[PDB]
Every structure is written in C-alpha cells, then in structure tokens.
Amino acid sequence: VGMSLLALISIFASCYMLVAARSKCLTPYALTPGAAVPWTLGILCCAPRAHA
Amino acid sequence: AASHSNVVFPDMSGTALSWVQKISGGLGAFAIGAILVLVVVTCIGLRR
C-alpha cells in the first residue's frame, strides 16, 4: 500500500507540473490577438485546434 | 503404431515459416512507409 500510494503521488505531481508548465508557456498568447506559432502548437497542445 | 505425439505444425524458424515471415515483413515495411508518407503530407497540410 505504501509503495503504491507513493508512486501515485509522484505520477500525479509530475502530471500537474507538466500541465502547469504548459499553461504558463501558453498564457501570454491569449492576451494578444496574435498567432500561436504552429511550431510551438505542435509540441505544446492547446485548446484552440484550428481557430486562432 | 506411431511412437510420436503426432504434432505437425513446424517451428517459426522453419523454411516455410521463414518465407512467410520475410514476405509479411516486406509488406509491413511497405505499409509503414505509406503510413509515414500520409502522416507527413497531412501534417504539412494542416500546418498551412
């Protein structure tokens, strides 16, 4: 039980860190009426798939 | 009477199954190449 719980905690922490890093990298692009840099769009998936 | 257990399916390393493996491998390589071509083309098309 201890090992399983620790593994789940670590994997959740890593997933949260990835999501937060994505949000922090793509936050400034929704504060401008500009383009999303398809180069960055491919690597960093965002909610706008085709629009904007 | 027979002194064996009467099993006939050959090994995967046999001549017949080697031929089958080689032919399937060639066809699979062709299919994978076609998949890659389609994926590259569609990604380039979507990047526009």
- The distance of A38 to chain B (nearest Cα, Å) reads 7
- The distance of A42 to chain B (nearest Cα, Å) reads 9
Residue B11 and residue B17 in contact, taking contact as beta carbons nearer than 8 Å: yes
CA pair distance A13, A2, nearest whole angstrom = 17
A51 at B interface, C-beta within 8 A: no
CA pair distance A43, B29, nearest whole angstrom = 27
* DSSP alpha helix (H) spans, B1-48: 15-47
B45 at A interface, C-beta within 8 A: no
A49 at B interface, C-beta within 8 A: no
For residue A48, the chain B residues in CB contact (below 8 A) are: none
Scanning every residue of chain A, which has its alpha carbon at the shortest distance from the alpha carbon of B46?
Answer: A50
Instruction: Tell me, in Å, the resolution of the deposited structure.
Output: 3.4
> What are B46's two structure tokens?
């979507």
CA pair distance A1, A8, nearest whole angstrom = 11
CA pair distance A10, A4, nearest whole angstrom = 10
Looking from the CA of A1 toward its CB, the CA atoms found within 13 Å total 0
